Amino acid sequence: SHMTIGDLTIHPDAYMVSKRGEKIELTHREFELLYYLAKHIGQVMTREHLLQTVWGYDYFGDVRTVDVTVRRLREKIEDSPSHPTYLVTRRGVGYYLRNPE
């Protein structure tokens, strides 16, 4: 899928995302997580659901793994990672991707 989510552009060719003409390399997991959240745009995904889908079965309960990967994704894709607007936390529930523009 070629997709845009505000200033982010996903192409299917590579483990990366593009943002306003800049290409940003992602790890396999970072990409899989981002793409998965993109498919489920604006849907809140719990950490256990993300673990099972992106990781999966043997990783159940490794919720920190999701949190650290989210943090890394934010560090790569957000204008200001400490104030995310694309990859947002629904407190106590999970994570979602949105178009903030």
Q: How far apart are CA 49 and CA 42, in angstroms?
A: 15
**Which of 101, 99, 95, 100 is closest to 36 using CA atoms?**
95
What domains lie within the chain, and their CATH numbers?
A: 1-101 (1.10.10.10)
Name, in order, each residue with C-beta under 8 angstroms of 4's C-beta and a sequence gap of 6 or more.
10
Backbone torsions φ then ψ of 54, nearest 5 degrees: -90, -30
- 97 sits in which H/E element: strand 94-97
Q: Nominal resolution in Å?
A: 1.9
DSSP state of 53: I
